[PDB]
Amino acid sequence: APLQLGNCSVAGWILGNPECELLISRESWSYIVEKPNPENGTCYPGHFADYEELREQLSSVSSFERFEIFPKESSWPNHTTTGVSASCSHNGESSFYKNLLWLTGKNGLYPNLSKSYANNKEKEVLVLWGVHHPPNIGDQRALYHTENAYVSVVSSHYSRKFTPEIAKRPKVRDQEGRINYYWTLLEPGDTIIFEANGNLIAPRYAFALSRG
Amino acid sequence: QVQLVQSGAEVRKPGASVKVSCKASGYTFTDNYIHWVRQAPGQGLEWMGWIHPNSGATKYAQKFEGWVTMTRDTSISTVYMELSRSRSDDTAVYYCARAGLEPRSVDYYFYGLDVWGQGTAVTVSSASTKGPSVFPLAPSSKSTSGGTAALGCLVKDYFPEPVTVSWNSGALTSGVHTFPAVLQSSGLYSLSSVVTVPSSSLGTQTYICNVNHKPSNTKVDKRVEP
Amino acid sequence: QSALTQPPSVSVAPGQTATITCGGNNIGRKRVDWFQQKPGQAPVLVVYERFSDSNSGTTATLTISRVEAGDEADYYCQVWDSDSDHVVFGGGTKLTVLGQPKAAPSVTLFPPSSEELQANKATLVCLISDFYPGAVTVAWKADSSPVKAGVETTTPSKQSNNKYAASSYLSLTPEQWKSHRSYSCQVTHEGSTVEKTVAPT
Ligand SMILES: *[C@@H]1O[C@H](CO)[C@@H](O)[C@H](O)[C@H]1NC(C)=O
Ligand SMILES: *[C@@H]1O[C@H](CO)[C@@H](O)[C@H](O)[C@H]1NC(C)=O
């Protein structure tokens, strides 16, 4: 009972690349059918961490539920949530990954944020997020109002502090900036905490899953 | 609705402070960046920098960094632009503009300048009040145009504006053009008035220009002869 | 001269279509804000069936369909430069809506007056009148050499008969005035150029 990915990569599918939402949703599958060289993946360029490990974790699943870990319109009262890009276009229209939110400043401010989530799903929860590395200082100031930014992510099984490095990368899909993608599996009962003062590409949707 | 109202015209001596204010209304003052842009006489627009009323953060153009200071007062919804050490260079009209045009993408994340103030005219000169010198612009074979001839008067080195010109006490209005003033690098104003007359009237008809400069309480009547 | 490039002037008869181009780095991938400025007034943001916008590579284009009198103005393009965090304006386009017949300027240059010279000063006065459309460039010369100091010029304004006039001044010392064979005021209007000369005789 295989999961057909079509023109998408696991990266495209799991992040919610706009071209990848046309695929039929599944709650279980024995293996993953995926084109050798898939067209749509990370529509916004960046490094996807532990990618091979993640494909293996997702290889076979007995239960799969997408849920809104951090509701878009509720979680972020003092930040702007509408961020979109032509690099992630859908129907000729600038857009973004279904499963992440591009947070930016609001009314001249990007207030320190702290958002936590407790896994009460009784199944492992796959959580994904990103860290944005602007191509220059102008974009850094315009988006986040802060030049010295950090993103911090913590649970019982994950602990990292990220800092953007602002500089040009080779132009890919019309971007010289980058987004690095990260993920963790959260134990039942464990809590994960995100803190940032800029540059967080927040989780919007997460995945409760079983593998056997 | 949404509008920005700036303070009135200013005359300052160089080295003094020039402070221009901008009051916003019709919307929540703390929402948007407020920019300042200036326009020198006869030229285009140059960005000076912005201030965000909510955070108080500022950014100045390289050219103005260290010369200009922007501030805000949320209690009265007013932003200020200040030139601490003013120069003759600084003579211009200054605008404030609200950046309310929201960007549609993070690819180009710049709020556009959607509502401008009316502008404030700032004049910087070291001059005190001075009455004009009036000199004749005499007709000759070089200002004639076969049947018509041009003559005028130069109203030189006065301060401040304005000055009015008439010809033959107002009797002569046909063919008269009085030009606006230039501000000279001296810090004094000059203008000209010119009349086109029949060239047969030269050395027959008398032509007198009358110049009034109320700020110095001066009137000059100057005979213009060939 | 400017970071953004615009054509200096566009003239168009009413009903026709006017096109204004703006050239700049990565312009095609940005929002180019256009500003309309009428005489004596502050700029307003051009917002939008008549007025339409269109980018491409390093070119953004403002198109005004079926031009009306209220469209006549100076237009400035503007973008934000990401790298240096700096707002940049084009040099501007004077858009004239042709509502009267065209006219090359008449030029009248007066030498320093005898009374001024005796007061130990010297001003050459160049009067430019009866022209349309309302833009000219003025240049001065001392014996065929360009002079770019001591010059002040007015921006053109309307005459009683609705045409444009402007003036330009060249300030000298009596010594400078007597030192040259001649001085010239040179006026350019629509390709055509008119030069007037005075000499200390
Ligand atoms: C998938 O991508 C291929 C290769 O570019 C394309 O020809 C095809 O039309 C696409 N089909 C789907 C599933 O959208
Ligand atoms: C999807 O793949 C097609 C085929 O290469 C490409 O043209 C398009 O830019 C991709 N879109 C996204 C959102 O990845």
B19 and B88 co-located in one domain: yes
Domain that holds residue B199: 127-226
Atom 8 of ligand 2: nearest residue by CA position: A40
B72-104: b or e for each residue (b if 16 or more CB lie within 10 Å)?
Answer: beeeebbbbbebeebeeebbbbbbbbbbbbebe
Taken in order B123, B127, B130, B133, is the CA torsion positive or negative?
negative
Report the candidate in C177, C198, C156 with the shortest Cα–Cα distance to residue B137: C198
Contact (Cβ atoms closer than 8 angstroms) between residue A131 and residue A178 = no
Nearest-angstrom CA–CA distance, A78 and A75: 9
CA dist C34 → C52, C92, C127 (Å): 11, 10, 34
The residue among A87, A137, A171 with the most chain C CBs within 10 A of its CB, best to mutate, is: A137
B138 and B152 co-located in one domain: yes
HEC string of A151-186?
Answer: EEEECCCCEEEECCCCCCCCCECCECCEEEEEEEEE
Q: Are strands A85-90 and C137-142 parallel, antiparallel or unpaired?
A: unpaired
CATH number, domain with residue A156? 3.90.209.20
Contact (Cβ atoms closer than 8 angstroms) between residue C96 and residue C189 = no
Domain that holds residue A69: 1-212
Identity of the residue numbered A77: P
Report the candidate in B155, B160, B149 with the shortest Cα–Cα distance to residue B195: B149
Asked if A174's CB is within 8 angstroms of C82's CB, the reply is no
| Tokens (6 digits) for B100 | 């309310």
CA distance C146 to chain B (A): 19
CA distance C14 to chain B (A): 26
Nearest-angstrom CA–CA distance, B140 and B146: 12
DSSP secondary structure string for all residues of C110-175: EPPPHHHHHTT-EEEEEEEEEEBSS--EEEEEETTEEE-SSEEEPPPEE-TTS-EEEEEEEEE-HH
B166 and B139 co-located in one domain: yes
DSSP state of B161: S
Of A85, A86, A107, the CB nearest to B54: A107
DSSP state of A106: B
Count other Cβ atoms within 10 Å, centred on residue A28: 14
Domain final residue pick, B89, B110, B126: B126
CA dist B224 → B1, B143, B166, B196, C123 (Å): 55, 13, 13, 13, 17
B6 and B85 co-located in one domain: yes
Name B221's bridge partners.
Answer: B210
Contacts of C84 in chain A (CB under 8 A): 138
Ligand 2 geometric centre to CA of A64 (Å): 26
Of A102, A108, A141, the CB nearest to B106: A102
Show the domains of chain C with their CATH numbers: 1-99 (2.60.40.10), 100-200 (2.60.40.10)
CA dist C60 → B119, C17, C42, C104 (Å): 28, 16, 23, 32
Per this entry, what is the length of chain A? 212
Nearest-angstrom CA–CA distance, A72 and A206: 13
> Is C70 exposed, middle or buried, given 0-12, 13-18 or 19+ CB atoms closer than 10 A?
exposed
Distance of CA C196 to the CA centre of its chain: 20
How many domains are contained in chain A? Answer: 1
Q: What are phi and psi of A121, to 5 degrees?
A: -85, -10
Domain final residue pick, B88, B103, B126: B126
Contacts of C29 in chain A (CB under 8 A): 174
Spatial neighbors of C109 by CB under 8 A, at least 6 apart, are B142, C124, C125, C126, C127, C184, C185, C196, C197, C198
B105 has a chain A CB within 8 A of its CB: yes
B131 and B114 co-located in one domain: no
Contact (Cβ atoms closer than 8 angstroms) between residue A39 and residue A18 = no
B29 and B107 co-located in one domain: yes
Report the half-sphere exposure of C145 (CA within 13 A, side-chain side): 5
Structural element, H or E, at residue A56: helix A51-57
Nearest-angstrom CA–CA distance, C21 and C55: 9
Q: What are phi and psi of A183, to 5 degrees?
A: -160, 155
The residue among C125, C157, C201 with the most chain B CBs within 10 A of its CB, best to mutate, is: C125
Contact (Cβ atoms closer than 8 angstroms) between residue B47 and residue B35 = yes
Question: Angle C1-C5-C8 (CA atoms, 0-180°, nearest 5)?
Answer: 85
Contact (Cβ atoms closer than 8 angstroms) between residue B43 and residue C155 = no
| Tokens (6 digits) for A29 | 């599958």
Taken in order C21, C25, C27, C31, is the CA torsion positive or negative?
negative
Per this entry, what is the length of chain C? 201
B30 and B114 co-located in one domain: yes
Per the listing, tokens 């039942």 go with A188
Report the candidate in A41, A46, A39 with the shortest Cα–Cα distance to residue A176: A46
Atom 13 of ligand 1: nearest residue by CA position: A6
DSSP secondary structure string for all residues of B108-143: G---B--EE---EEEEE--PPPBPPEEEEE---TTT
Q: Which atom of ligand 2 is nearest to the CA of A7?
A: 2
Distance of CA C37 to the CA centre of its chain: 14
**Closest ligand relative to A96 C-alpha:** 2
B58 and B142 co-located in one domain: no
| Tokens (6 digits) for C175 | 């010594």
Spatial neighbors of C36 by CB under 8 A, at least 6 apart, are C43, C44, C45, C46, C73, C74, C75
> Is A104 exposed, middle or buried, given 0-12, 13-18 or 19+ CB atoms closer than 10 A?
buried
B51 and B150 co-located in one domain: no
Ligand 1 geometric centre to CA of C189 (Å): 60
Q: What separation, in Å, do the N-terminal and C-terminal C-alpha atoms of chain C show?
A: 39
Q: Is A76 helix (H, G, I), strand (E, B) or coil?
A: coil
Q: Does the beta carbon of A88 sit less than 6 angstroms from any atom of ligand 2?
A: yes
Ligand 1 geometric centre to CA of A7 (Å): 6
CATH number, domain with residue B176? 2.60.40.10
How many domains are contained in chain B? Answer: 2
CA dist B69 → B24, B82, B90, B111 (Å): 19, 5, 14, 21
> Is C177 exposed, middle or buried, given 0-12, 13-18 or 19+ CB atoms closer than 10 A?
buried
A167 has a chain C CB within 8 A of its CB: no
Contact (Cβ atoms closer than 8 angstroms) between residue C74 and residue C10 = no
Spatial neighbors of A56 by CB under 8 A, at least 6 apart, are none
Distance of CA C156 to the CA centre of its chain: 9
Contact (Cβ atoms closer than 8 angstroms) between residue C155 and residue B42 = yes
Nearest-angstrom CA–CA distance, C58 and C200: 52
Categorise residue B44: left if φ over 0, alpha if ψ from -120 to 50, beta otherwise: beta
Residue C156, preceding bond cis, omega within 30 degrees? no
Of B110, B112, B154, the CB nearest to C123: B154
Residue C14, preceding bond cis, omega within 30 degrees? no
B183 and B82 co-located in one domain: no
| Tokens (6 digits) for C133 | 């459309």
HEC string of A115-152?
Answer: EEEECCCCCEEEEEEEEEECCCHHHHHHHHCCCCCCEE
Of A86, A104, A141, the CB nearest to B107: A86
Resolution of the PDB structure in angstroms = 2.5
CA distance B104 to chain A (A): 8
Report the half-sphere exposure of A93 (CA within 13 A, side-chain side): 6
Domain final residue pick, B71, B103, B126: B126
